[PDB]
Amino acid sequence: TARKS
Amino acid sequence: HEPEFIGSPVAADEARSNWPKRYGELKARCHYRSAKVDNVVYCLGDDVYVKAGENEADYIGRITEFFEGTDQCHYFTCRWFFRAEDTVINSLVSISVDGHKHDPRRVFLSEEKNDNVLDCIISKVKIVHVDPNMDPKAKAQLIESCDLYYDMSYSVAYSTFANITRTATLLDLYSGCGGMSTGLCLGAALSGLKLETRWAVDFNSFACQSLKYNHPQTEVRNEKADEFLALLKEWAVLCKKYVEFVVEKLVGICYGGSDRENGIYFKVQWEGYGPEEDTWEPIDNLSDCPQKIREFVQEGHKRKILPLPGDVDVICGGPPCQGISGFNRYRNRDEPLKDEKNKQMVTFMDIVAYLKPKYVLMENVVDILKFADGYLGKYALSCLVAMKYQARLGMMVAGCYGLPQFRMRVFLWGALSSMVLPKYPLPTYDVVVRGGAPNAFSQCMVAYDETQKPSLKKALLLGDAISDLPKVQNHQPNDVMEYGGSPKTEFQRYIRLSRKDMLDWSFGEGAGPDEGKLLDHQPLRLNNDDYERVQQIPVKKGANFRDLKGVRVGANNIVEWDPEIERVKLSSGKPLVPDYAMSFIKGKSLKPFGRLWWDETVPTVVTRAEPHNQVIIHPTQARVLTIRENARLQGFPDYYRLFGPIKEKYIQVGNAVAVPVARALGYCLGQAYLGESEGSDPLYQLPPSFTSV
Ligand SMILES: Nc1ncnc2c1ncn2[C@@H]1O[C@H](CSCC[C@H](N)C(=O)O)[C@@H](O)[C@H]1O
């Protein structure tokens, strides 16, 4: 679960 | 089977140079150029599908880094691609405009970056860059060979979709009296571009009368936008085909109309008749004189009385959207377009779709970004993007450009990929912007950040704008009069400049009409009761209806009748203090019959001039603010003449886009248009030459 932000 | 970096490490010094922040949030022990995940090797520059959260769409990224973290974990860094859904456009990918859809295989390269454990990598993707301006065939060949493609970038700031003497025609939709277009052309002139409003469309006859007076050369059409669109369509075919009481000439054309069923009509002037005798006859009623129809079409086509596709460089508009605030803030949200009349938004984009202008400027209220989670705002933007326009969105506060008001509006740029996308001009006045930004579009406010302190001009107040104007009364029938004397302030010196000084070429060489005249200095004529009331409002800062006889403040700042005094009545026998005033804002309002002061500003100049629910009474004179005073507050040059009944004149001013705002935008347009723009910063600082003297 990459984490885009 | 467990992810492992491959090849030798990037030279320690080189890694240090390339990626400084990693040495000295995540920190690196060393960088590699490659990694192997599930039996497939990836390299810096490879484009890759990345695993996201449970049940969320895979991210799409360009690998920029491969490094071992100080936590001895294996990471990779990506510069993300946005799917159209992934942008601000969101759920509005599903819209289409005249057959223009969002290609699901079109992405946009962003500068957003994220780190990840190597095991999130899913697979490689063939993503190619297609030059928007490359030849059409090659372009299809390229797109043919790929999994995904991109022709533009996406930036979160100002929702920017962007590529990776001269004359220009402009078309003003929903033109009103021409606030936006007038200003645009003026700014443009300063850029060195000669931009002229060639056609204007508005269904209020008085607004048109105003625009046509100040811009004689422009083809001012008093009709509905949708009718104008239809007319255009039929005009196309007419050009392709090129076609007693006696008919001398055909002077006009229109499609449909107020009483008339759809279909073309021509305006005929009859032999021996003065104008004002000309009338509209249907197209087939004139099958009699097909030659005269010819005279008109060929003649109209050469003077370009109406635009065919390609004829219009710029389109600006302020399509009305109502029911998106107040009582209507909460109604009809699911299909806002079908609903009510947010419909003009569709029509606007329909005309853009039909004309395909090099630039699009779309103005509107901030609520389009709030109502139904910014639906209308997204819709406008989505349309431009599906039509393959570059685009950006920004919010501009009028007072920031030299006006005694705080009028925040939304402006949407569009530009063909063959054109340079315009920027937003920074504030020139030290008014401060608050948290007014819709968290949906949090990054579209055009303002300087606090981090940067730049010296800006002192914020303008009401006195700064109207202190030089001569006294007049409740009833003032003269729409043309003499100034009492010279202007007193820098602002006053500016709005009293002639058309030439303003670089306003509407009348070409030579001065226009009304030079040095005070126009429309007339207030709403209050009826005898209202007039009697304002006459009783003390002249002092903060004065309002509470200052009227027989009223007092009860506990909790709630207005009351003073038990000691019986209701007062005017000569008419009506109450001096009206009932609505007593209940307005739960009886806590200070607005009814409020008097302005020189100290103050008018947050938003509005279309109605009644003193009932607003502070609109002149500081010293027993009257409401005059039309011209509202005009100045709105940044109109003093020479810009308004026509129609007074109420209609107020409506015109109140609807308008603040001229200085439009002028600033005009400048940015001029520069982008002339290719005299600079690299890709969303914001542009106007030069010294602009701003003032
Ligand atoms: N259905 C319609 N067809 C054409 N014009 C319309 C219209 N509905 C509203 N309008 C015109 O909407 C303008 C929208 S207010 C526009 C102010 C203008 N942009 C300026 O800066 O001066 C007015 O002309 C309003 O009457």
Side-chain angles (χ1 to χ4, degrees):
Chain A
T1 93
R3 132 173 248 262
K4 254 183 79 205
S5 281
Chain B
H1 259 65
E2 180 117 284
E4 56 161 319
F5 294 114
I6 101 152
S8 76
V10 181
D13 282 5
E14 191 198 336
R16 205 163 281 262
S17 172
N18 289 2
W19 309 293
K21 295 208 221 71
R22 298 272 183 218
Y23 298 103
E25 162 118 42
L26 250 59
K27 294 280 169 145
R29 284 174 55 111
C30 69
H31 281 71
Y32 293 84
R33 292 198 182 270
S34 184
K36 170 149 84 188
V37 185
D38 298 290
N39 297 46
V40 182
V41 179
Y42 302 77
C43 294
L44 291 181
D46 282 347
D47 290 316
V48 73
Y49 280 119
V50 182
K51 191 62 185 179
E54 194 191 24
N55 205 46
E56 186 179 345
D58 300 10
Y59 301 137
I60 301 181
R62 185 91 102 209
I63 306 176
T64 54
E65 270 171 277
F66 266 135
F67 71 81
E68 180 177 336
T70 47
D71 48 14
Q72 304 199 141
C73 287
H74 303 344
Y75 301 99
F76 77 96
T77 299
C78 278
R79 146 133 100 144
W80 301 122
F81 285 95
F82 279 70
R83 270 170 290 240
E85 311 81 289
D86 298 325
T87 69
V88 85
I89 283 180
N90 207 177
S91 100
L92 268 109
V93 287
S94 32
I95 72 84
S96 60
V97 200
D98 182 10
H100 292 96
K101 305 193 160 64
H102 290 295
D103 192 335
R105 282 193 308 153
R106 184 154 174 257
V107 291
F108 309 86
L109 178 53
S110 83
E111 265 159 17
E112 298 304 302
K113 261 147 136 139
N114 279 98
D115 299 332
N116 265 104
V117 286
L118 255 33
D119 96 280
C120 295
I121 295 182
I122 289 169
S123 78
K124 307 181 66 171
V125 220
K126 218 315 157 199
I127 304 186
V128 311
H129 170 262
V130 5
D131 177 330
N133 288 136
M134 64 176 298
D135 118 35
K137 257 139 256 305
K139 189 184 285 201
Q141 258 208 28
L142 201 57
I143 299 182
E144 188 174 32
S145 73
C146 81
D147 297 321
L148 306 177
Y149 74 85
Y150 69 110
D151 64 322
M152 300 191 184
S153 73
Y154 178 71
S155 327
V156 166
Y158 306 93
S159 297
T160 304
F161 292 71
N163 292 351
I164 272 158
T165 216
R166 301 181 53 157
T167 329
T169 69
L170 165 89
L171 166 73
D172 193 352
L173 272 38
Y174 308 94
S175 57
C177 72
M180 175 152 54
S181 56
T182 299
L184 266 186
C185 300
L186 264 43
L190 256 107
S191 284
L193 176 69
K194 184 191 303 175
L195 176 77
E196 52 207 17
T197 320
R198 293 289 300 266
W199 319 266
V201 177
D202 187 356
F203 80 165
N204 182 283
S205 66
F206 306 114
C208 297
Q209 201 170 333
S210 293
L211 199 157
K212 182 64 178 190
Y213 179 104
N214 287 296
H215 306 292
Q217 294 302 105
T218 122
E219 217 62 32
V220 188
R221 305 193 59 91
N222 192 190
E223 61 192 21
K224 286 197 176 186
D226 68 359
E227 298 168 354
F228 177 68
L229 170 51
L231 168 61
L232 293 183
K233 306 224 197 81
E234 291 281 47
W235 179 253
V237 316
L238 284 184
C239 289
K240 192 228 174 179
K241 130 136 67 178
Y242 299 93
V243 142
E244 189 178 2
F245 240 75
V246 59
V247 5
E248 158 118 272
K249 208 175 187 183
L250 283 199
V251 167
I253 184 168
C254 90
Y255 179 100
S258 266
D259 328 33
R260 347 190 223 270
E261 281 196 358
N262 312 344
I264 261 55
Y265 296 65
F266 284 96
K267 205 211 187 193
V268 326
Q269 126 185 10
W270 289 284
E271 161 190 303
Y273 283 133
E276 283 302 310
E277 290 312 343
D278 322 33
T279 83
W280 302 94
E281 291 295 323
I283 180 63
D284 299 344
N285 185 340
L286 296 211
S287 275
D288 222 84
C289 43
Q291 177 55 23
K292 267 104 158 229
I293 289 183
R294 234 169 174 267
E295 325 264 283
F296 185 64
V297 179
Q298 292 164 167
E299 186 53 30
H301 172 81
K302 197 195 295 305
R303 302 178 117 82
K304 219 149 295 179
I305 55 170
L306 253 38
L308 300 168
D311 285 349
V312 15
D313 303 322
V314 188
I315 294 187
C316 68
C321 282
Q322 335 242 268
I324 80 204
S325 74
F327 183 54
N328 290 91
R329 158 54 135 121
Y330 303 88
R331 192 112 27 156
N332 101 351
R333 320 190 312 255
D334 270 61
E335 295 302 320
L337 299 187
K338 275 138 158 188
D339 260 325
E340 336 154 318
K341 230 223 325 120
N342 302 29
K343 291 204 185 244
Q344 285 332 278
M345 181 67 76
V346 179
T347 294
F348 181 86
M349 287 311 170
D350 264 332
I351 302 176
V352 177
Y354 178 83
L355 289 186
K356 287 314 216 71
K358 297 172 204 170
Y359 287 94
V360 167
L361 180 58
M362 199 256 238
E363 185 277 326
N364 220 287
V365 300
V366 176
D367 270 330
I368 79 171
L369 297 189
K370 299 177 177 216
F371 166 86
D373 206 48
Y375 183 108
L376 297 181
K378 299 170 183 176
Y379 171 85
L381 189 57
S382 183
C383 288
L384 290 187
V385 174
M387 280 194 281
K388 288 219 155 209
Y389 275 84
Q390 299 173 86
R392 67 166 40 118
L393 191 70
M395 286 170 280
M396 304 184 49
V397 175
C400 291
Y401 305 86
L403 296 176
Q405 62 184 317
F406 186 114
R407 163 187 291 250
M408 205 187 299
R409 289 307 191 270
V410 176
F411 299 85
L412 170 69
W413 279 126
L416 292 181
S417 73
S418 74
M419 232 65 199
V420 179
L421 182 72
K423 300 164 178 209
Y424 296 113
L426 293 158
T428 52
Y429 286 76
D430 77 27
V431 174
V432 66
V433 189
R434 223 56 172 151
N439 298 119
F441 304 71
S442 29
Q443 301 222 22
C444 296
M445 183 71 51
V446 1
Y448 288 96
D449 40 349
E450 39 224 298
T451 142
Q452 153 141 34
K453 335 221 251 186
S455 270
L456 296 179
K457 303 191 92 189
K458 194 188 173 218
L460 260 26
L461 301 172
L462 181 54
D464 294 327
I466 71 174
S467 64
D468 59 314
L469 296 173
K471 264 188 174 69
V472 303
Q473 302 180 291
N474 187 49
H475 173 48
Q476 139 67 196
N478 300 129
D479 68 338
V480 177
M481 76 166 80
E482 298 295 303
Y483 290 99
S486 298
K488 300 182 174 182
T489 73
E490 190 174 60
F491 179 91
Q492 290 158 15
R493 287 180 235 127
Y494 163 78
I495 41 71
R496 283 171 66 155
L497 299 162
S498 67
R499 280 174 214 268
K500 283 168 170 186
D501 290 334
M502 288 292 203
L503 298 195
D504 187 328
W505 296 311
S506 297
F507 292 77
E509 291 192 75
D514 312 305
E515 201 164 17
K517 286 296 194 291
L518 175 49
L519 309 154
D520 309 318
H521 192 33
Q522 332 168 247
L524 183 72
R525 181 171 197 176
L526 303 175
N527 64 35
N528 285 327
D529 289 343
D530 279 333
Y531 182 48
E532 225 174 291
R533 299 194 178 97
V534 342
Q535 263 181 285
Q536 272 193 60
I537 306 289
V539 337
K540 74 186 179 188
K541 186 181 174 71
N544 64 79
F545 84 90
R546 281 177 168 213
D547 292 314
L548 288 185
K549 164 139 167 185
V551 37
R552 68 184 296 268
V553 199
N556 305 144
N557 201 48
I558 297 168
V559 71
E560 273 187 359
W561 300 121
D562 182 5
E564 218 174 3
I565 301 181
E566 272 150 9
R567 255 247 221 194
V568 188
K569 349 215 95 281
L570 308 144
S571 285
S572 88
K574 279 226 153 64
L576 163 69
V577 176
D579 282 60
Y580 64 86
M582 294 283 98
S583 72
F584 191 47
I585 311 301
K586 300 300 180 192
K588 297 212 181 90
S589 180
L590 292 149
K591 277 169 187 185
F593 291 85
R595 180 184 296 281
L596 286 172
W597 203 244
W598 317 103
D599 255 323
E600 309 172 347
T601 69
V602 177
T604 303
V605 171
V606 291
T607 50
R608 275 167 239 113
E610 299 81 25
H612 309 161
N613 303 97
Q614 52 180 175
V615 180
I616 184 144
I617 293 176
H618 188 276
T620 63
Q621 290 160 49
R623 67 165 177 77
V624 131
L625 254 43
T626 77
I627 289 165
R628 185 90 267 144
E629 295 175 333
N630 265 10
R632 252 132 97 127
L633 259 33
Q634 196 76 324
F636 277 93
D638 266 15
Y639 68 64
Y640 211 78
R641 195 176 182 187
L642 300 172
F643 289 82
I646 278 147
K647 286 200 181 74
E648 291 292 326
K649 287 176 166 185
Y650 275 114
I651 291 178
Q652 281 163 63
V653 171
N655 277 336
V657 159
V659 184
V661 179
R663 215 169 78 91
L665 290 172
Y667 193 87
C668 300
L669 176 50
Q671 288 243 122
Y673 190 96
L674 291 169
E676 289 160 21
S677 192
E678 197 281 326
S680 54
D681 182 332
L683 302 173
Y684 173 81
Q685 171 174 298
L686 299 171
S689 83
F690 182 99
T691 126
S692 247
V693 274

Coordinates of all heavy atoms in Angstrom, one line a residue, chain B residues 10 24 26 30 40 86-87 121 178 198 289 335 404 420 449 491 509 518 558 626 679:
Chain B
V10 N 25.1 3.2 -7.1 CA 25.4 4.5 -7.7 C 26.6 5.0 -6.9 O 26.6 4.9 -5.7 CB 24.2 5.4 -7.6 CG1 24.5 6.8 -8.2 CG2 23.0 4.8 -8.2
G24 N 22.9 13.1 5.1 CA 23.3 14.2 6.0 C 22.5 14.2 7.3 O 22.5 15.3 7.9
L26 N 12.7 9.8 4.7 CA 13.5 8.6 4.7 C 14.9 8.9 4.2 O 15.1 9.6 3.3 CB 12.9 7.6 3.7 CG 12.2 6.4 4.3 CD1 11.1 6.8 5.2 CD2 11.7 5.7 3.1
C30 N 22.5 3.8 0.7 CA 23.0 3.9 -0.7 C 21.9 3.7 -1.7 O 20.9 3.2 -1.4 CB 24.2 2.9 -0.9 SG 23.7 1.2 -1.0
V40 N 11.2 -10.0 -12.3 CA 11.3 -9.0 -13.3 C 12.2 -7.8 -12.8 O 12.0 -7.3 -11.8 CB 9.9 -8.5 -13.7 CG1 10.1 -7.5 -14.8 CG2 9.1 -9.7 -14.2
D86 N -8.0 10.9 -11.2 CA -7.1 11.2 -10.1 C -7.0 12.7 -9.9 O -6.6 13.1 -8.8 CB -5.8 10.5 -10.3 CG -5.9 9.0 -10.4 OD1 -6.8 8.4 -9.7 OD2 -5.2 8.3 -11.2
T87 N -7.2 13.5 -10.9 CA -7.1 15.0 -10.8 C -8.3 15.5 -10.0 O -9.2 14.8 -9.6 CB -7.0 15.7 -12.1 OG1 -8.2 15.6 -12.9 CG2 -5.8 15.1 -12.9
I121 N 5.7 -2.8 -6.4 CA 5.8 -2.8 -7.8 C 5.0 -4.0 -8.4 O 5.2 -5.1 -8.0 CB 7.2 -2.9 -8.3 CG1 8.0 -1.6 -7.9 CG2 7.3 -3.0 -9.8 CD1 9.4 -1.5 -8.4
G178 N -20.4 44.6 -20.1 CA -19.1 44.4 -20.7 C -17.9 44.7 -19.7 O -16.9 45.2 -20.1
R198 N -15.4 41.5 -30.6 CA -16.0 41.5 -32.0 C -17.5 41.1 -31.9 O -18.2 41.6 -32.7 CB -15.2 40.5 -32.9 CG -13.8 41.0 -33.2 CD -13.8 42.2 -34.1 NE -14.5 41.9 -35.4 CZ -13.8 41.5 -36.4 NH1 -12.5 41.4 -36.4 NH2 -14.5 41.3 -37.6
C289 N -37.3 37.2 -52.6 CA -36.1 38.0 -52.9 C -34.7 37.3 -52.6 O -33.9 37.9 -51.9 CB -36.1 39.3 -52.3 SG -36.7 39.3 -50.5
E335 N -28.0 15.9 -10.1 CA -27.7 16.1 -11.5 C -27.9 17.6 -11.6 O -28.9 18.1 -12.1 CB -28.8 15.5 -12.4 CG -28.9 14.0 -12.4 CD -27.5 13.4 -12.8 OE1 -26.9 13.9 -13.8 OE2 -27.1 12.3 -12.2
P404 N -12.1 49.3 -3.5 CA -12.6 49.3 -2.1 C -13.7 48.2 -1.9 O -14.8 48.5 -1.4 CB -13.2 50.7 -1.9 CG -12.7 51.5 -3.1 CD -12.5 50.4 -4.2
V420 N 0.4 29.3 -25.5 CA 0.9 29.4 -24.2 C -0.2 29.7 -23.1 O -0.9 30.6 -23.3 CB 2.0 30.4 -24.0 CG1 2.6 30.4 -22.6 CG2 3.1 30.1 -25.0
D449 N 2.1 34.1 -0.6 CA 2.1 33.4 0.7 C 2.7 34.3 1.7 O 3.4 35.2 1.4 CB 2.9 32.2 0.6 CG 4.1 32.3 -0.2 OD1 4.3 33.4 -0.8 OD2 5.0 31.4 -0.2
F491 N -6.6 57.0 -7.0 CA -7.7 56.2 -7.6 C -8.6 57.1 -8.4 O -8.9 56.8 -9.6 CB -8.5 55.5 -6.5 CG -9.7 54.7 -7.1 CD1 -9.5 53.4 -7.5 CD2 -10.9 55.3 -7.4 CE1 -10.5 52.6 -8.0 CE2 -11.9 54.6 -7.9 CZ -11.7 53.2 -8.2
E509 N -8.8 56.1 -33.5 CA -8.1 57.4 -33.3 C -9.1 58.5 -32.9 O -10.2 58.5 -33.3 CB -7.4 57.8 -34.6 CG -6.2 56.9 -35.0 CD -5.4 57.6 -36.2 OE1 -4.6 58.5 -35.9 OE2 -5.5 57.1 -37.3
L518 N -19.4 63.6 -16.1 CA -19.8 62.8 -15.0 C -21.1 62.1 -15.4 O -22.2 62.7 -15.5 CB -20.0 63.6 -13.7 CG -20.6 62.8 -12.5 CD1 -19.8 61.5 -12.3 CD2 -20.5 63.6 -11.3
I558 N -30.5 42.1 21.0 CA -31.7 41.9 20.2 C -32.6 43.1 20.2 O -33.1 43.5 21.2 CB -32.4 40.6 20.6 CG1 -31.6 39.4 20.4 CG2 -33.8 40.5 19.9 CD1 -32.1 38.1 21.1
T626 N -24.9 56.4 -5.4 CA -25.4 56.5 -6.8 C -24.8 55.4 -7.7 O -23.8 54.7 -7.3 CB -25.0 57.9 -7.4 OG1 -23.6 57.9 -7.8 CG2 -25.3 59.0 -6.5
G679 N 8.6 30.6 -18.2 CA 8.4 29.3 -17.6 C 7.2 29.2 -16.6 O 6.5 30.2 -16.3

